Design an enzyme around this catalytic site. Sequence first.
Site, PDB file in Angstrom:
ATOM      1  N   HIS A  43       0.737  -1.389  -0.154  1.00  0.00           N
ATOM      2  CA  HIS A  43      -0.027   0.122  -0.016  1.00  0.00           C
ATOM      3  C   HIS A  43       0.932   1.154   0.088  1.00  0.00           C
ATOM      4  O   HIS A  43       0.269   2.362  -0.532  1.00  0.00           O
ATOM      5  CB  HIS A  43      -1.000  -0.233   1.197  1.00  0.00           C
ATOM      6  CG  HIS A  43      -2.051   1.038   1.109  1.00  0.00           C
ATOM      7  ND1 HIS A  43      -2.645   1.384   2.080  1.00  0.00           N
ATOM      8  CD2 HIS A  43      -2.418   1.809   0.093  1.00  0.00           C
ATOM      9  CE1 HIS A  43      -3.619   2.197   1.986  1.00  0.00           C
ATOM     10  NE2 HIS A  43      -3.447   2.497   0.710  1.00  0.00           N
TER      11      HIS A  43
ATOM     12  N   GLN B  27      -4.471  14.321   3.123  1.00  0.00           N
ATOM     13  CA  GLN B  27      -3.159  13.919   4.112  1.00  0.00           C
ATOM     14  C   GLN B  27      -2.103  14.366   3.236  1.00  0.00           C
ATOM     15  O   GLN B  27      -1.904  14.215   2.349  1.00  0.00           O
ATOM     16  CB  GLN B  27      -3.489  12.271   4.405  1.00  0.00           C
ATOM     17  CG  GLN B  27      -4.554  11.984   5.155  1.00  0.00           C
ATOM     18  CD  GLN B  27      -4.392  10.641   5.450  1.00  0.00           C
ATOM     19  OE1 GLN B  27      -5.099   9.605   4.905  1.00  0.00           O
ATOM     20  NE2 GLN B  27      -3.620  10.440   6.305  1.00  0.00           N
TER      21      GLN B  27
ATOM     22  N   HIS C 274     -16.450  19.849   6.232  1.00  0.00           N
ATOM     23  CA  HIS C 274     -15.262  19.710   5.149  1.00  0.00           C
ATOM     24  C   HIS C 274     -15.782  19.952   3.633  1.00  0.00           C
ATOM     25  O   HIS C 274     -15.124  20.689   3.214  1.00  0.00           O
ATOM     26  CB  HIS C 274     -14.698  18.391   5.554  1.00  0.00           C
ATOM     27  CG  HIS C 274     -13.835  17.817   4.282  1.00  0.00           C
ATOM     28  ND1 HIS C 274     -12.712  18.351   3.802  1.00  0.00           N
ATOM     29  CD2 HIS C 274     -14.127  16.831   3.108  1.00  0.00           C
ATOM     30  CE1 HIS C 274     -12.263  17.666   2.630  1.00  0.00           C
ATOM     31  NE2 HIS C 274     -13.116  17.101   2.477  1.00  0.00           N
ATOM     32  N   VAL C 275     -17.045  19.242   3.563  1.00  0.00           N
ATOM     33  CA  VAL C 275     -17.588  19.264   2.157  1.00  0.00           C
ATOM     34  C   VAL C 275     -17.778  20.796   1.654  1.00  0.00           C
ATOM     35  O   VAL C 275     -17.777  21.507   0.834  1.00  0.00           O
ATOM     36  CB  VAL C 275     -18.528  18.342   1.683  1.00  0.00           C
ATOM     37  CG1 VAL C 275     -18.868  18.500   0.278  1.00  0.00           C
ATOM     38  CG2 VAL C 275     -17.977  16.793   1.907  1.00  0.00           C
TER      39      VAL C 275
ATOM     40  N   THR D  82     -11.315  13.117  -1.325  1.00  0.00           N
ATOM     41  CA  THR D  82     -11.574  14.499  -0.881  1.00  0.00           C
ATOM     42  C   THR D  82     -11.853  15.234  -2.440  1.00  0.00           C
ATOM     43  O   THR D  82     -12.558  16.376  -2.471  1.00  0.00           O
ATOM     44  CB  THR D  82     -10.322  15.198  -0.271  1.00  0.00           C
ATOM     45  OG1 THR D  82      -9.236  15.369  -1.345  1.00  0.00           O
ATOM     46  CG2 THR D  82     -10.095  14.475   0.855  1.00  0.00           C
TER      47      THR D  82
ATOM     48  N   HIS E 160      -8.282  10.530  -3.779  1.00  0.00           N
ATOM     49  CA  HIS E 160      -9.511   9.956  -4.298  1.00  0.00           C
ATOM     50  C   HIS E 160     -11.143  10.455  -3.947  1.00  0.00           C
ATOM     51  O   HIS E 160     -11.832  10.664  -4.543  1.00  0.00           O
ATOM     52  CB  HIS E 160      -9.501   8.355  -4.100  1.00  0.00           C
ATOM     53  CG  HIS E 160      -7.919   7.885  -4.568  1.00  0.00           C
ATOM     54  ND1 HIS E 160      -7.390   8.574  -5.488  1.00  0.00           N
ATOM     55  CD2 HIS E 160      -7.285   6.397  -4.559  1.00  0.00           C
ATOM     56  CE1 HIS E 160      -6.282   7.853  -5.862  1.00  0.00           C
ATOM     57  NE2 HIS E 160      -6.439   6.477  -5.344  1.00  0.00           N
TER      58      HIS E 160
END
Length: 681
Positions: free
Chosen positions: A188, A491, A553-554, A574, A572
């Site tokens: 990952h 992040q 946030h959105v 956000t 992906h």
Amino acid sequence: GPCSNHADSLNNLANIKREQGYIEEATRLYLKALEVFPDFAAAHSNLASVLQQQGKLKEALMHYKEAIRIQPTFADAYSNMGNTLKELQDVSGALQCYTRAIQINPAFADAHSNLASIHKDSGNIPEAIQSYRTALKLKPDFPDAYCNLAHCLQIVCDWTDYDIRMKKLVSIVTEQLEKNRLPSVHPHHSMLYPLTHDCRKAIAARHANLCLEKVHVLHKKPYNFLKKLPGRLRIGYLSSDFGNHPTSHLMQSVPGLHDRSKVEIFCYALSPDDGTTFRHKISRESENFVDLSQIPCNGKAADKIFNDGIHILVNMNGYTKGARNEIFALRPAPIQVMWLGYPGTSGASFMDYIITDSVTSPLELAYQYSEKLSYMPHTYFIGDHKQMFPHLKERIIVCVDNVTVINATDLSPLVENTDVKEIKEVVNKPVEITHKVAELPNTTQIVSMIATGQVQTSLNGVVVQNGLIVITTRRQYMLPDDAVVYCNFNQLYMIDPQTLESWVEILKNVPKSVLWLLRFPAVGEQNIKKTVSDFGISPDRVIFSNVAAKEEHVRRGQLADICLDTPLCNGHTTSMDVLWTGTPVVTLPGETLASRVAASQLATLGCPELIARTREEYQNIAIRLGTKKEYLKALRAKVWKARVESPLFDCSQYAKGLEKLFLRMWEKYENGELPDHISAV
Ligand SMILES: CC(=O)N[C@@H]1[C@@H](O)[C@H](O)[C@@H](CO)S[C@@H]1OP(=O)(O)OP(=O)(O)OC[C@H]1O[C@@H](n2ccc(=O)[nH]c2=O)[C@H](O)[C@@H]1O
């Protein structure tokens, strides 16, 4: 007496058999050694670590304790016991074992590294970094310590020695693969480092083999399958993320939207009920809900799946926290599929198909993947935004559309008691755009509410809640009102030096421009300031806000002018969040799947003009957009229009696409066909 010498013969013989990879033989020989001389510390410890390899974690733990009882100063047993306790979710006990190993021997490099892993797992990165540093002072050639430290420096955007660090990482991996060892870099994390695609796939395959090995111990016979079908395909979605987790924020509407005459859906949860609405919704909507977190044994879990008679088993985890990939290695369904949760290949022989699209995974790049490609009609990505954030379907400007904004599920009270109107503006093509505008020329009590930190205010009898009927303003986040705001809300680990250089490049060429990022985590803020400063731009022009709750946030994103994607690894989810508010995102796709997700989203949105082809074009697209007011206005309107017209947020189109893909997978199976690339349209 010795006797203890006979026990030695067997212990070393078991050791020899373990080196050669005969795990069952070794176990039996370690047992035979202990039947002969029970008070044998080294043999208990060796048996325990063989038992740990095979997934028999409870038994390993029993024999490490026997070793430690017999030899209290056996620092190495304490250390490995700490790892077994770690794997068993007991972070508390692991911590004491590693502590004890350090007390026995403060110079035990591994115990410091193991301790550092605990700290890293718990989000305590500064502490983890000290412990990894400590491990590397004591043992400088410590690949596991080095690669985990490297990952911590990414999380915090410490880029000192970045270029040599990246090459050192690549050396260690390639070396490890050649010596036939499991590498120190996690599949990952693979996508952050300049490894070849072949390298990344080999790391993935080795983790897949681990799963096969762990599972070989059960000695199960291969499952025998139903070959013909007469009505419904049985599909099983298997995930540890049914609850409050980004995965459910994307896909929660999908099980309930599936055509029940074509497919029967089973949702297999790998994690406990967390009491959230997201879990409830998937529980109700899905025709079948099974909780496999109540079935700890992977063997039994596979059996349940086989017994439900599932044709297509969908892995939504890949190599992420909570995965139980041993289930997939047992092959309880004739066809097994990767979908949505893991942006990479599994490298596994027991995975047949990966769900993507032609932009994310162009056939030119198929060698990256062990799986055969399967193309959704448009992007493989989705979001439940239309259902989760209906109040964000449009904005109401108060008095420029991104300085002060009102949102509401029900606008009645406001429209009934103030001058809200739907103006038209013409912008040079020649485009007409509609805005909803609430005008009250009393900015005071709106600014005053934010200024004093008030929860509420009232415009003409109507209650308006402070966004920190809702109001969002640039003041809330310390953004200048006249600023052109470029944002990224990922992040921070997604940012590399080349990315940041480009961003400073655009900031230098865009008159009143500012960069809006998130303390994600807080300790990265300082490093980013320092580097920005070093690149010749005032640190004050990079504004950081706190990680907020999903809704805030959105909603915030509405205040940005332009969003900038991270080409190392795209944002992906956000990026879905930001598109939902009609904020353009400019991206530069690379070669890995995780590099190409935004391009895929934008292509579906019908905005290829936002997909760069070089760093130069990336920067130029972003500079043009902050510099040509009219062009920016036209593109935000286009993005807004596309968000409701296009398939990107259409969850029902998405269900249909999955169905076609599943049908196609079955057709091939029904005939004698090996998996090959397929497409829905
Ligand atoms: C690279 C990678 O591994 N990608 C994975 C994807 O490939 C999978 O498709 C995703 C679902 O399986 S998981 C993962 O996707 P990512 O985008 O990395 O999400 P990540 O785990 O960082 O958090 C962002 C969330 O925090 C929320 N968020 C963000 C900021 C904020 O202030 N508040 C907030 O709630 C945001 O609204 C988001 O809900």
